[PDB]
Design an enzyme around this catalytic site. Structure first.
Site, short mmCIF file in Angstrom:
data_model
loop_
_atom_site.label_atom_id
_atom_site.label_comp_id
_atom_site.label_asym_id
_atom_site.label_seq_id
_atom_site.Cartn_x
_atom_site.Cartn_y
_atom_site.Cartn_z
N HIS A 8 0.94 -1.28 -0.24
CA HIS A 8 0.01 0.09 -0.07
C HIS A 8 0.72 1.37 -0.13
CE1 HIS A 8 0.87 0.90 4.15
NE2 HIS A 8 0.88 -0.29 4.48
N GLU A 74 -0.70 -6.71 8.11
CA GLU A 74 0.59 -6.40 8.27
C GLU A 74 0.95 -7.10 9.70
OE1 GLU A 74 3.89 -4.32 7.30
OE2 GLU A 74 3.69 -6.24 8.25
#
Length: 169
Positions: A8, A74
């Protein structure tokens, strides 16, 4: 199996040296711009995405409608979320850099994190685009014996579980 791993775009902590894991921070304006530059450049394959806002927003701006999966998140930094990397105790700092023996206090162990990432990849039946995070991309690239440093907002295509095919920046 051709898999595209998309890191991202920029969030405020990504540019200010702060650990960003499960804290649900949004993309900055430039982060959104990085995502839009991916539209048309990434192959229109089925898309999957971490449920964290920054990843979902990247997928959306990239022109995809992904299926949300927490397994693509994450790593959770627990008590170290937002932690200033500068003053981060050397023990954790050295551990993250080597990518082993790392269990941020209150968060996920690196072993647990890598297991859910690789297990998720095993469930893929055809080429797909994965909107995910730096830690995920790094884990995959390291497993293939390559450096896992990819620019935020960029993507790397891999032929899992063999080698890297191409790095798109």
């Amino acid at each position: 199996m051709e898999l595209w791993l998309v890191r991202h775009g920029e969030t405020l902590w990504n540019r200010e040296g702060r650990l960003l894991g499960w804290t649900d921070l949004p993309l900055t304006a430039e982060g959104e711009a990085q995502a839009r530059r991916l539209k048309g450049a990434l192959p229109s394959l089925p898309a999957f995405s971490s449920d964290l806002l920054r990843a979902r927003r990247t997928a959306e701006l990239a022109g995809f409608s992904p299926r949300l999966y927490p397994e693509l998140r994450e790593i959770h930094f627990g008590a170290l979320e937002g932690a200033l990397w500068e003053t981060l105790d050397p023990r954790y700092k050295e551990a993250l850099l080597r990518f082993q023996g790392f269990h941020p206090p209150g968060g996920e162990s690196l072993s647990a994190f890598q297991e859910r990432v690789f297990r998720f990849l095993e469930g893929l039946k055809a080429p797909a685009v994965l909107f995910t995070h730096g830690g995920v991309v790094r884990a995959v690239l390291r497993a293939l014996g390559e450096d896992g440093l990819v620019p935020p907002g960029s993507a790397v295509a891999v032929d899992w579980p063999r080698r890297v095919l191409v790095r798109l920046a």
